[PDB]
Structures are given as structure tokens and as C-alpha cells.
Amino acid sequence: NVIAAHKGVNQAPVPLKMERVGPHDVHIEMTAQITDIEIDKGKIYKAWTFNGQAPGPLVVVNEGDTIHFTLKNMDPVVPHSMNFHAVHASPSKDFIDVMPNKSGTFTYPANKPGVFMYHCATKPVLQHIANGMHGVIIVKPKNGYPTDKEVDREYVLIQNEWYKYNDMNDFQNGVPSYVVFSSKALKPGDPNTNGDTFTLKEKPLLAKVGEKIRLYINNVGPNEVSSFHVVGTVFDDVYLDGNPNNHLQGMQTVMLPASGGAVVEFTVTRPGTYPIVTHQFNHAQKGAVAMLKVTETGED
Amino acid sequence: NVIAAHKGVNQAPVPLKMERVGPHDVHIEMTAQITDIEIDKGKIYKAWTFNGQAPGPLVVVNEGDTIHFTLKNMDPVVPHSMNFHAVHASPSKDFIDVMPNKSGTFTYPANKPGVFMYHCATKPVLQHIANGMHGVIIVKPKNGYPTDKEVDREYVLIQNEWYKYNDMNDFQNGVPSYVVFSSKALKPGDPNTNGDTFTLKEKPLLAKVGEKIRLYINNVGPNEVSSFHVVGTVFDDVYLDGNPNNHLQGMQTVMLPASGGAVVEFTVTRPGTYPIVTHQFNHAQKGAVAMLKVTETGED
Amino acid sequence: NVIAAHKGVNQAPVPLKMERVGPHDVHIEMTAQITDIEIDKGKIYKAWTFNGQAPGPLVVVNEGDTIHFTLKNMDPVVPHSMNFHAVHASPSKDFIDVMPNKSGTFTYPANKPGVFMYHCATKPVLQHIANGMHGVIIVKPKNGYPTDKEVDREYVLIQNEWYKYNDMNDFQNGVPSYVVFSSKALKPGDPNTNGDTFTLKEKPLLAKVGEKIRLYINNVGPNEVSSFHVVGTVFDDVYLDGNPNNHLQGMQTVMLPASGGAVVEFTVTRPGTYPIVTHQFNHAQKGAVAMLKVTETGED
Ligand SMILES: [Cl-]
Ligand SMILES: [Cl-]
Ligand SMILES: [Cl-]
Ligand SMILES: [Cu+2]
Ligand SMILES: [Cu+2]
Ligand SMILES: [Cu+2]
Ligand SMILES: [Cu+2]
Ligand SMILES: [Cu+2]
Ligand SMILES: [Cu+2]
Ligand SMILES: [Cu+2]
Ligand SMILES: [Cu+2]
Ligand SMILES: [Cu+2]
Ligand SMILES: [Cu+2]
Ligand SMILES: [Cu+2]
Ligand SMILES: [Cu+2]
Ligand SMILES: [Cu+2]
Ligand SMILES: [Cu+2]
Ligand SMILES: [Cu+2]
Ligand SMILES: [Cu+2]
Ligand SMILES: [Cu+2]
Ligand SMILES: [Cu+2]
Ligand SMILES: [Cu+2]
Ligand SMILES: [Cu+2]
Ligand SMILES: [Cu+2]
């Protein structure tokens, strides 16, 4: 399971590069790179990543934007690729491999609003996803969501699993060793974290008493479904996959398939710390608990 | 996995205490207690329970009721707590531990209609849920459900798993040993049972030919999702989490996350016995089959 | 796990027999038979089947049709039966066993539109399903689907698992050895395949650039849920269980319970080959990837 050319390799994170190039066109450049991430205290995973993050950096575009995407493969020996669930594309032409030390550019439209998974598409896809090559792209709906004016504060959360290192038998046949949440920044000052068992417990997300919170969520897997629940509240409104039409109300828990997304909104009525879980409690026990700290001011 | 102070302990079930104290206020008193339950024939589980039942006793309130909840902890050594998924509360103030031989009182509103899980909230939550500290609270919608006038008969069903006794490794990493249904009484004469592999086979729920049946259902887990199905019928109407807005029709099978609820309604057209399953058939084989006996009169 | 009377038995497939006998009445005759199926290259499973296919042959009826169903049991020693999820029936009278070398006839209505599982109902049901006795019945809605006029081409896909041969311990407690797709023909010229790891990769489904494709899908299990996703597109419209009322839009991935169905519709915008997966990637790795080849003409 050890790739000789990855020994000792720890490529420092590289910032996502994005720039708008027209009213409906956006350039995005990512890397594929090999980066050590502390997934549990004392446990380093030499992850296969986009940009040195796992899950990868957040991408946000508008409905109707065409994405001109470049992948720069920094892995010395493994090809990598990109599949955005947001886009309409030819997989065999547009989600193809970029060889080590090369770049590739691929263009495709994001026609549909929502909270989409992205991930590496190189065979075996399970191997590339499980080693860390997953993330979220949000496509903002042209006309918003009907409840936009009620939302006071918003964050992005992503659920993923971690297995035994680069172990295809475990990836296929074993239970996850860890299941984790991470948060990816939407506005300056938001946290930006990797999938680990501890950061969002020790540095909770912050909010203020009485606020309606929106979370953009996706369960990237690779393998498990998620029973997403915020303790001490009920979801006022849920939009499955973030499409405004798929509108549920008053859900205690949102069932997410592997790669499933949602926009969920809830009110926090009292000061305190509110756990955020997958209610599949074996997974929660193995790391998948984040915290939301609600104060009279909204500051820690 | 054996707690010395639980040896030989078998605390007889204690009735739930509920009383309305105002037009929108209700007192509820439960216990936390250690009680032997026969989960399969010849198999005793010394369960951690509310009130000596696992799942615990049914709670029914109205939308807009504030619950003034008291937990009396009869466990000689383990703290326990209560988390109602129905309520808006501060988890770190209102879902806190009650020490052995003590009581605690916590007040919070049930603002949202539906079929909610409740459970102990004491760390490790997986341990407390898996050992039996789960249940359902139903919050009745102020304006009912649109199909109320069509329903002839109704029952509550709950799905849960059982693992190796108090074994955190198994709870986290193992398949369930048993998966089971129980029924909790809504009206005098309804059965009231615990999560076991046999009672609802040997003493089926009863109905009459031609009736529309409503089931209030919740899959409390701890770990598995449920593929809820009634053999020989199709769900005419489904309300996800019991919120009247989340209205599906003509479903063969309802996907429930861990902690997921629903109101489901179906018509039984012919005399006979109708199995009720999770269609994840490994779980059905390990206990999760209940029976509905439909007769020309509705009596056995 | 070896049944002596099945040694060397390989009953050649028998065609489904269907004929309409009135404006709202249809005769269907199936067999139960024991047939060797190559589920992975070099791996034969001596399946328990309807008609020598696993999943079994496709059945299509109209909403409001009463089905007069005959099962001819060709198994020399095991009883078999039939449960259609489409129908309202008495399970203990209408889904009963047919003994070896006998036939039984059962009549029941299909009142509800959708994409329903069918399967053998003989105890242990897990054993009969896992050994291959599953399939789909489609009930066409009297008034169609609102998007009917947009659909250019349609196919049926079914997901199932395969375990160690006739091994009840594995069926209950083990991970699937294979997870697979098959396609069942709706119109002359459509492929008709069994649940295997390779046929729909080597002989992809065919379509033409720009088309809107409808898939009628069901995850028959026995045990797993499915995270159904088409690479390179987004589902424009989804009807859960194939009921026109259960209408979602813009889903990346559709969560299917065990026995869950859907009608899903999506547009393929560019020439190429488009994988079709369960996004639970351990299952995809173990076989559950089909291909859709999209050409400028629609022919290979
Ligand atoms: Cl919880
Ligand atoms: Cl069934
Ligand atoms: Cl994919
Ligand atoms: Cu414009
Ligand atoms: Cu450290
Ligand atoms: Cu990769
Ligand atoms: Cu994907
Ligand atoms: Cu698992
Ligand atoms: Cu506000
Ligand atoms: Cu809430
Ligand atoms: Cu009042
Ligand atoms: Cu006994
Ligand atoms: Cu407890
Ligand atoms: Cu909970
Ligand atoms: Cu399991
Ligand atoms: Cu009636
Ligand atoms: Cu029905
Ligand atoms: Cu007619
Ligand atoms: Cu061969
Ligand atoms: Cu059979
Ligand atoms: Cu079934
Ligand atoms: Cu599995
Ligand atoms: Cu067209
Ligand atoms: Cu699409």
C-alpha cells in the first residue's frame, strides 16, 4: 500500500485560484498533490488531495456559469482528474487524466443550482476518493431560495470517511476507521478546515442566540450514507441537493446518500453548544461530531 | 463490559407520568433504570432504559406544548440525560446529566409536528443509545394531516438494533446481532412492547378488512438506516418526519435515516396476515419483521 | 450450503409469458428455476431464479390492471412463491408457496403507478432473494408523467448484490462480494441482461447526443441502499418510486432504500461514455458501474 515515490512527500497546500472572466464564465485552477493531514490526534494520513486540503477547497459559482477548469498534477507518479457533479460534460473527454507534472484544461457548464460533490475520476475511483480527493462545489441559484431573507448566518460542512492508509481491501470491505466533518469558508473570517475528528469540537462554529443558520452540506463518502442532525433544533427548511424546488420542512434528520447534498436551515433559540452529528452513531463515535457555539453576541 | 454495580440489578418497570398543566404546558417524568429485557428467545439484555422499557415509553404532546421534563436517575453508578428531537433547547444546559440517585428538571418547547426520536445524551452517546436509551415522542399537528378523515386505525412502531452486551467495539465496528420492531400504545387496548425479535410475530397488530391504517414510525438506530415496507400493500400517503408538508404518495418503501420518522398510511384489502419489514433483508432475518393480522371483524 | 438435488442442475432460461385478457386484466406466467449465471468473469452462481434470469424478467402493466399470475415451480426440492410490491394482496393467501413440480395461480390488482420490486416470498426470504429471486414490475401511470413529451429514449436498470453461494451467515452478516447492474428490455432491440459486473461495461447502453434519457430504476438489494448517480449529468426530474406526485428536480444522486424505485431523467449533452454508478464507491468497485455510450447517431 506504500507508493515508493510518495515516501517523505508532503507538498505544502497551494491556494485555489479562481477568477471571473465573463458574466457567465469562470476560471478555476486546482492542483493534485500529496499532503500529510492529521485526521485524528497523533494520526497522519498522507492524503491524495486537491490543493493540499481534504476535502478540497470550496468552489462557489453562479447558476449558468461555464467553468474553465485547469488541474495541475503535482503527484510525482499517479495520474489524477476532476469530476464535478455540478456540470454537464462528456466524462470520457472532459473528466480525463492529467499525468504527473502536467496540466489539463476542461470546460463545462454548471446549469443547475445546488450543493454538489466534486472528486477525482481516475480509476480506481474508490482509491482516489478514499485517499482524499473529494470536495464541494456550490452553484448559487439565480433566484435564490425562498427563505433567503430569513437566514442570518451560513456555513459549509462536509462529511467524509477515512480508512486504513491506501488499502484497497479495507476501502472495499472494511468499516471506516474515522468519519469526520470539515468546514470550508464562504466569507472572510469563516474557518477552513480538513476532515478530522477534533477541529470543529475544539474550535466550534460560532453563532448568536436567536439566529437562523443555513448549512450547505454534502456527504462525500466514499462509502457511507449520512443521517444529518443538529442537536437542540429542528430543520425549519431543507432543500435536497440545494435545488430550491426540493423543499421539505420540519425535518429532524436529513438522509444523504453518498455524494448527497442539501441546504438546511434551523433556528438556535438559547445560548449553549449544539452538537452537529451524523445520527448513525457508530460514525459519530468515530469522529463525526462538530460543534456550534451559540452566544449572546456571536463571538467566542 | 460488565459494570460491577449493575450485577444482579433488574429494576422493575415504572410507569411514565404525564399531566397537562396548562393549555400549552405539559409535565413529564421519566426514570433512567437498569432492566432485564428478553430481546430474543433465551437472550436477556440488561438494558439501560427509560422507565424499564426499550425503546422507552411513548410520549404524545400537541404542537406548541412546552414540556417540563424530569428525569429521575435510578442507575446506581452511571449518569443519564434526555435529548428530545422534538424540542428547541440548549444542549449544554438542557440535555445535561443527572447523577445517580438524583433528579433533574428541564423545560423546552415542542414547536414542530412529527414523529421524533428521543434518547439519552450522555457521553458516549452511542453507548447509551445502543444499551437501550431511545424512544419516540409524537407531536400532534395543530391542524392535523390532510388525510386524517380517511384513517380507520393507527399504531406506533419503532425499529432498533441490539449488539453484543455493552461492547463499545461491537457498537462501533460490528454488525447488529438483532434488529427489531416494537409497538407503543396510543389508545387503551393497544399493545405496548419492547424491541424484541418475536412479540409482534406471535401477537400481531390487529386490523379489519378494508381499513386504512396509519403507522407512526421511527428508526432509532443506533447505527442502521431502515427501508420500511408493509407486504401486500403500498403506502397511499407518507409524511416524512410526520410533518404534514413533506407529503409523498404511492411509495412501496420509505427510506428512514437513523433517527428518521414518518407517518405512513396504507389500505389492507383482504383478510390475512401482512408482514411489516425493513427491506434490508439481513436485518429482517435478524428479527425486524412484525405482523399485522387483518380479519373480517378486527378482533383476533 | 450445497443442496444435493441442485448438483449439476442448470435449467435453461424460459421466456416470460404475458397476455392481456381484458381492458384491465393481464395473465402472467413465470417459472421458478435453478440456472447457472456468470456474475463476474470466471464466477458462476447457481442462482435461484424466475425464468432463468437474475434479476428476473421485466413485467410491465398499466395502472388499474389486475394480474392473474401463475408460478410454475421447476426447482426439484425447494418451494418458491411471488410477492409483487405493486399489488394489494393478502400475503398469507396470495403470496404462498408453490411446491416443486407444481403450479399456483394468484390474482391481485396493481392500483398504483411506479417501479416496483418483485421477489420470492418463501421463508427465509433473505435466502430466496439473495440467491437471485428478485426483479421489477413497472406499472404505467394512466396519465403518464408530466415530462413524458421531453423524453427521447428510455431503459430499465436494476441494482442487486451477490454473496457467497447460498451462505446464510454471509447473507446476514457479511459484506457483498459483488454489487451489480442489469438492464431489462422495454422495446425490441433493447438489451436484456443479468446482474453481473461486466456486461453493461463491455456493451454499454446506447444514446444520441442531446437526448433526454429516462431510466426506470430499482435497487432490489437484498441488503444495501443505493446512491444512484449518472456521471457527467444531473437528474432534471426524479419521481420517487415512479409515482408522478413524488417529483424532485435537479438531483445529483438519488437515495434508494432496499427495494426502492425511481423514474429518473437526465440530458446527455456531449458525445462520450458516461458511467452509471452507485456512489457508495465500495459497491461500485465491486461491480456496480454500467456505461452509457452517447454518439452523434445513437448507434454503436
Ligand atoms: Cl443526537
Ligand atoms: Cl417484502
Ligand atoms: Cl461519480
Ligand atoms: Cu447574462
Ligand atoms: Cu498532532
Ligand atoms: Cu486522483
Ligand atoms: Cu461522483
Ligand atoms: Cu459501514
Ligand atoms: Cu433572524
Ligand atoms: Cu429547529
Ligand atoms: Cu392557546
Ligand atoms: Cu424466554
Ligand atoms: Cu444514559
Ligand atoms: Cu439525537
Ligand atoms: Cu450494518
Ligand atoms: Cu376506511
Ligand atoms: Cu397499499
Ligand atoms: Cu376501463
Ligand atoms: Cu466466463
Ligand atoms: Cu424462492
Ligand atoms: Cu418485498
Ligand atoms: Cu454493506
Ligand atoms: Cu430531446
Ligand atoms: Cu443532468
Residue numbers in the entry:
A (entry chain A), B (entry chain A), C (entry chain A): 16 to 315
From the paper:
Copper-containing nitrite reductases (CuNIRs) catalyze transformation of nitrite to nitric oxide, which has impacts on geochemical, agricultural, and medical health fields. CuNIRs typically have an ∼110 kDa homotrimeric structure, like a Reuleaux triangle. Each protomer contains one type 1 copper (T1Cu) and one type 2 copper (T2Cu) site. The Cys residue forms a peptide-bond bridge (Cys-His bridge) together with one of the His ligands at the T2Cu site to transfer the electron to the catalytic T2Cu site, which is coordinated by three His residues and an axial water molecule.
